[PDB]
Amino acid sequence: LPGKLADCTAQDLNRTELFLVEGDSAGGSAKQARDREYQAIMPLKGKILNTWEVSSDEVLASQEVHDISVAIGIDPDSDYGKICILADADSDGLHIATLLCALFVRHFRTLVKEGHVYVALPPLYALTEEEKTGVRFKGLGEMNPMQLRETTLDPNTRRLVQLISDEDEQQTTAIMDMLLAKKRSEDRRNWLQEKGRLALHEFTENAYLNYSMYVIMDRALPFIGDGLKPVQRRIVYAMSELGLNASAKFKKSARTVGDVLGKYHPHGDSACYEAMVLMAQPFSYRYPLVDGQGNWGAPDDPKSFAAMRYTESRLSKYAELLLSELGQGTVDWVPNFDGTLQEPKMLPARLPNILLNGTTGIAVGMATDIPPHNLREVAKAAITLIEQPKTTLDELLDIVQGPDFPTEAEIITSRAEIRKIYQNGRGSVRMRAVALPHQVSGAKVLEQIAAQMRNKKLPMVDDMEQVMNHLFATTDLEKSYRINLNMIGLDGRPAVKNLLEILSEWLVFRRDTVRRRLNHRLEKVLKRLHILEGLLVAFLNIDEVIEIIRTEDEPKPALMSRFGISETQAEAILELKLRHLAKLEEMKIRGEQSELEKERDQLQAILASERKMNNLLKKELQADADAFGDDRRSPLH
Amino acid sequence: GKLADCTAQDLNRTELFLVEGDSAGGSAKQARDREYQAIMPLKGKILNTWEVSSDEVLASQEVHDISVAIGIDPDSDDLSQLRYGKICILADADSDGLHIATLLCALFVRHFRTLVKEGHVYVALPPLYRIDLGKEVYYALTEEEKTGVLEQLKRKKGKPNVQRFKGLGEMNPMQLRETTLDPNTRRLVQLVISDEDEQQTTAIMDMLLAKKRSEDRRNWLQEKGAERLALHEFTENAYLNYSMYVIMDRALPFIGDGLKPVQRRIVYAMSELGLNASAKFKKSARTVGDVLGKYHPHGDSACYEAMVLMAQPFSYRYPLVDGQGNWGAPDDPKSFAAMRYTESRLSKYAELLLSELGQGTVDWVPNFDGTLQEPKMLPARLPNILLNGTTGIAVGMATDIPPHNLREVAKAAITLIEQPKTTLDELLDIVQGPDFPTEAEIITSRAEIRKIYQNGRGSVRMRAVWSKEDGAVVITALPHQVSGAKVLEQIAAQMRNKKLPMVDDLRDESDHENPTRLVIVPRSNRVDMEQVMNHLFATTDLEKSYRINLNMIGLDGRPAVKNLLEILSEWLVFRRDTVRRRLNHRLEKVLKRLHILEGLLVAFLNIDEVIEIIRTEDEPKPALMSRFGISETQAEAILELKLRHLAKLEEMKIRGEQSELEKERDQLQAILASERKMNNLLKKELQADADAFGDDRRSPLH
DNA sequence: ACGTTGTAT
DNA sequence: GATCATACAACGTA
DNA sequence: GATCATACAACGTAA
DNA sequence: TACGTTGTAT
Ligand SMILES: Cc1c(N2C[C@H]3C[C@@]3(N)C2)c(F)cc2c(CN)c(F)c(=O)n(C3CC3)c12
Ligand SMILES: Cc1c(N2C[C@H]3C[C@@]3(N)C2)c(F)cc2c(CN)c(F)c(=O)n(C3CC3)c12
Ligand SMILES: [Cl-]
Ligand SMILES: [Mg+2]
Ligand SMILES: [Mg+2]
Ligand SMILES: [Mg+2]
Ligand SMILES: [Mg+2]
Ligand SMILES: [Mg+2]
Structure with missing residues (x-):
């Protein structure tokens, strides 16, 4: 009874149904469309606690899961008729559903085994990835109440699947374990590599897969x-x-x-x-x-x-x-x-932003932690990688000292340990205050030192080298940061890449981006010079050109025959303004043509020779580094 | 609770700042000098603690925390336990900031009189604009000051960037300190009350913050229509800008x-x-x-x-x-x-x-x-003021206009155009009265409604539509803004108390087919449901009244209570003015094109000479004007003509466009010349819009 | 004395 | 992203 | 419009 | 060893 949950009037378990909604907005829409005779709605604000490794008392501690137990009416010791999990058809809806399955399987096994748990199926347009078409439905929060009833609540038109078989009871309790186990993270990553009414073991596996792969590719x-x-x-x-x-x-x-x-x-x-x-x-x-x-x-x-x-x-x-x-x-x-x-x-x-700014993310089965680096150092390193493709990591480390955080604190990690970080792709670096380290709060630091001052561990402070060394290990004045160079490569798959694999793979992306840029500019210079060529022909014969337009009924074919010009050329002549007939506008065309002609052969030449294009890349990298580059803030020693 | 405290306890140097926005308060805490500056954000508006008792001030969480932070109880003569030295009212520079300031002045004048009289209350002056040109940066608390800075910088290189502050919340912490918190560059005025001004200060603020003295404020608006500063001059100007602002720019x-x-x-x-x-x-x-x-x-x-x-x-x-x-x-x-x-x-x-x-x-x-x-x-195109109606609450006055039917209001406007001497009694035959978005009936009599539309003020009543089927009352439509759940709760509460023992059950059969269907079942047929229904109309919300106060900003730019005839008559003046402006607008577009099409035909007839002039003369625009006696705007159209347009087909298209535009030119000039011709247009458009957007009467009158 | 209404904080 | 408390006029019921 | 609790991967810290 | 962090998500 307690809680912001809409209750049903009837008490016949044979006909009563309870719905668990993902969004509060969708819950309000569900309350408007529910049939008060036998339909009850309960909104689940946000995500629910992963109540798989949590103790029975811990499950009752969380307000969300606690209110769920009260509404269902069953205690987590396994001692309404149908409980339906209603969530949006987005990757999180499947995630929120899997978390509720873990709650019903471990703590309310009697409920899931008896067949009182259900999974609502909302449409996408057709819950599949458009597999029937080969032979857009807004979320539940953005759906109209009447549309939400015809889709999930109204039994005459809803799509509700019944969620553990006798033989599947062993695999259901085992598959969900590897999926919802905090320590079994390596078990989930290797499971994705292999994977790369309704049974409870078949639903949780497919549901968690869509969320695991989605979060990595489309988020973290x-x-x-x-x-x-x-x-x-x-x-x-x-x-x-x-x-x-x-x-x-x-x-x-x-x-x-x-x-x-x-x-x-x-x-x-x-x-x-x-x-x-x-x-x-x-x-x-x-x-x-x-x-x-x-x-x-x-x-x-x-x-x-x-x-x-x-x-x-x-x-x-x-x-x-x-x-x-x-x-x-x-x-x-x-x-x-x-x-x-x-x-x-x-x-x-224009510059490899992945290494300049760096991003830290958390996904399902994997994570990413990339620190920031200096601009001029990474740019000069990329220039050197173009000149000598056989450059080694040891040679590159001489150019780029290491990470460069937005702080004036010093990096205490040794050069030998940093080399191992960029070689194996994983590791950790440490920084010490000179200015506090990165993501270190100045106010928080004072509170830590004040507690030590209150206990009287440093009575001389109202000689400092010994005190500083103690505070570096005790307070946040010295902090380490984990480094995990994980990213989605050009192949569209995540993989841990070392410093040499990153710079080498990005230059392939840059050479492709420039190769596509040159083709674009070439077509604009070629077509314009092609259009201006026809104008001068028209300028030389304005008398005949204009006479043909005025005399001939349909001049588009006639212009092509008289001068042997193309259809696109004729349209340019027809779209010429009388103002352009002046002698000055002809000189402006002759001037515009002389410049464009020089640029036409350059694009085809750079696209033909690899040496000429590489010199351009080496030039653009240095030009961008001279403008946007800046000095090293955090020194490495 | 959520108050940033200062370390020092010296009242001579300590200062307290009251911020209007919680976002601005957080920014103030980052820029405050922790040595002697304390900040407390005031979430939302403050209670009008003028007629509230001393205990009521401690009941409100907002003002209560203010008393605790200040350290003085709402009993005067309690300055012995004052915590801070200066109490500063810091609010954004929008009309509400003056309102929030006035509400804090009312709190400090009645409950903390010792603070305001001793001179410990201050009023912060935040800037309105931030002008920056290079290393130099200036502020502008007033619009008259902004231009002064811009005019001053006109002699300096660069384009100054005028940054208007929508409020304290959008200011940077460092910028907020240099303007309000930092004593070396802030602008803080001391709000004091002289000995002789205590009588008018305690009297002026009363009329502003007195609940009953609403008519006194209304006539006050009609008549009104340094280091230190007097509180009676500040509160009066402050509350006036808010009172007028809310009327004109809100309700x-x-x-x-x-x-x-x-x-x-x-x-x-x-x-x-x-x-x-x-x-x-x-x-x-x-x-x-x-x-x-x-x-x-x-x-x-x-x-x-x-x-x-x-x-x-x-x-x-x-x-x-x-x-x-x-x-x-x-x-x-x-x-x-x-x-x-x-x-x-x-x-x-x-x-x-x-x-x-x-x-x-x-x-x-x-x-x-x-x-x-x-x-x-x-x-x-139609008088939306009467069709939809708006309910508003301002300072000194309010507005409550009910909705009316479209076809009824349109036909009334049409009748007023045909016979301008039409009376309200004749119009009431056309317009029955309000038309709410409900199927419930309006029980007010036609005679009582006539007094509403004549005097401009009044009240109308609505009653739920019901019919007893199978011996049980069934309520099909409720009054306007009447909640079905609220009605059921009221009748159920009476059933719980034993005040309705004759009724058996109370069911809610409202579904998707029938929007509203409340059933009331009696215990027996001998029970008179007519007597019970009359009781529930007076006891429950099944019968509800609606206040009517036809107050609105007229074309003269001033609010006034207007009767039904003054509204339609004044709107038809507004509509006739807008149509007269529409025709002149389209007319000027037809005239300018016909002036351009005239030049093209001239160019077509003498295309040989036109092109020869272009090629020979360096700048042909003046030459074309002299050779053909054409205008500069006509020449530009000729120069911008495409060679494709020289074909004979494109000339015929222009001559056809001119023949049509010439027809439209004389038609618009005719309607603009005769008032009768324009009235027939208005009479036609009003009927055309009523046939398209009009709908049947929803709320019946009986 | 309270509780409504609708733009505002 | 649901939840809180106020100003303002003014009438209507407890 | 400040305040609330969760998922997901694994470093560091003092336990 | 559980616990605190981190950042996009509900
Ligand atoms: C309701 C929700 C929260 N509830 C509170 C408590 C019931 C819960 N377990 C979930 C919360 F604690 C925080 C947020 C936040 C804050 N990052 C949001 F931006 C937001 O849009 N939501 C909704 C999108 C979920 C929030
Ligand atoms: C904080 C605030 C409220 N608090 C709750 C309690 C601390 C208070 N005394 C004021 C509130 F109750 C409602 C609102 C609303 C809703 N109309 C807002 F849109 C809003 O932006 N604010 C701030 C603009 C004021 C709200
Ligand atoms: Cl036109
Ligand atoms: Mg979603
Ligand atoms: Mg404001
Ligand atoms: Mg309100
Ligand atoms: Mg809401
Ligand atoms: Mg977080």
């Missing part, structure tokens, strides 16, 4: 090319589309988030703006992508930033390295979730 | 379009986003975001709530917005999904306010920051 793991996660990539592109360049005026962040959510990113607003705040804080990102006005947090409390309604943002000058060459046919374009617009799959990075 | 609607500013900025912003009735739905969060960033600098919740109301068919007679998702239900109108979940779009009825927008029919004023332009009104 970044793309090697632009070094951005999908949510990160969709933010920068939407800001460029909104005209929020470095020269434009600031715009309220709420509008930017609103467009990102409605256009490309169908997820929560808080998670999106938090990613925007991270890209804007100079103390969190080495080379921020966003510049904003207002309260964007402080080094002591990075989370103490004003709401998106009070802050105005705009892209930074550094962000131009990812979008300046976007519209020049350099990247593929895929449709968005609903398909009404197009989104770029990648961003043309 | 009271404009007679022309019948919309409040927030409503108009929503409908206009949606038209700019292409959200016409035919376009696809867009997430409401996007619409609200644009409305806030473009035109409406206020809270997001209050704006989206106004959008939701305009979309609910059970709240608006003719909704302006059509949406998908959970937009609430008649039982719980507030049970609507958040703006991030709902997608909206303008309704077909909204076309009556925007179809003529781009046709030069309304004035355009700049927005708050001046970067965009906003329409002052919307060209309403």
